[PDB]
Ligand binder design. Structure first.
Ligand SMILES: [Cl-]
Length: 150
């Protein structure tokens, strides 16, 4: 076989928004944060390399090759692409009972491939809960809802 364990994409990092809350943010709140982040795109940027594996997503400065963000895959709450834009949201570590959600925005010719690569690295892990129900017995609306709350 020719299994791929990691992939790196060039992209321009446009910046991020951060949301603090006293309870984990709902789906409706996360989608509001994602739209607001996109609506801010005018435009300063940093060239980055975006590394995706089954364990984590890391953003490296392209020029220095030093990490700027390192997110374990299990903390990603949302990934989407629209045109050349990629939006990636992650729950940041906070003391107990405080919550911080970060929404990063990138631009790349490979936006759709990047979002697809993240999405599938994720739902690979999430479906690894055969040892906790058989995903293949959940409808589309059931699995989709699992991903949006769990
Ligand atoms: Cl890794």
């Amino acid at each position: 076989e020719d299994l791929i364990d990691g992939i790196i994409f060039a992209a321009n990092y446009l910046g991020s928004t951060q949301l603090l809350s006293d309870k984990t943010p709902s789906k409706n709140v996360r989608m509001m944060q994602a739209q607001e982040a996109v609506s801010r795109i005018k435009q300063p940027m940093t060239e980055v390399d975006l590394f995706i594996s089954t364990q984590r997503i890391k953003v490296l400065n392209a020029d220095t090759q030093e990490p700027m963000m390192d997110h374990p895959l299990r903390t990603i709450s949302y990934i989407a692409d629209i045109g050349n834009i990629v939006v990636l949201m992650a729950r940041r570590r906070m003391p107990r009972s405080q919550y911080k959600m970060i929404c990063h925005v990138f631009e790349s010719e490979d936006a759709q491939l990047i979002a697809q690569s993240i999405g599938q690295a994720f739902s690979v892990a999430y479906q690894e809960f055969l040892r906790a129900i058989n995903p293949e017995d959940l409808s589309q609306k059931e699995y989709s809802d699992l991903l949006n709350t769990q």
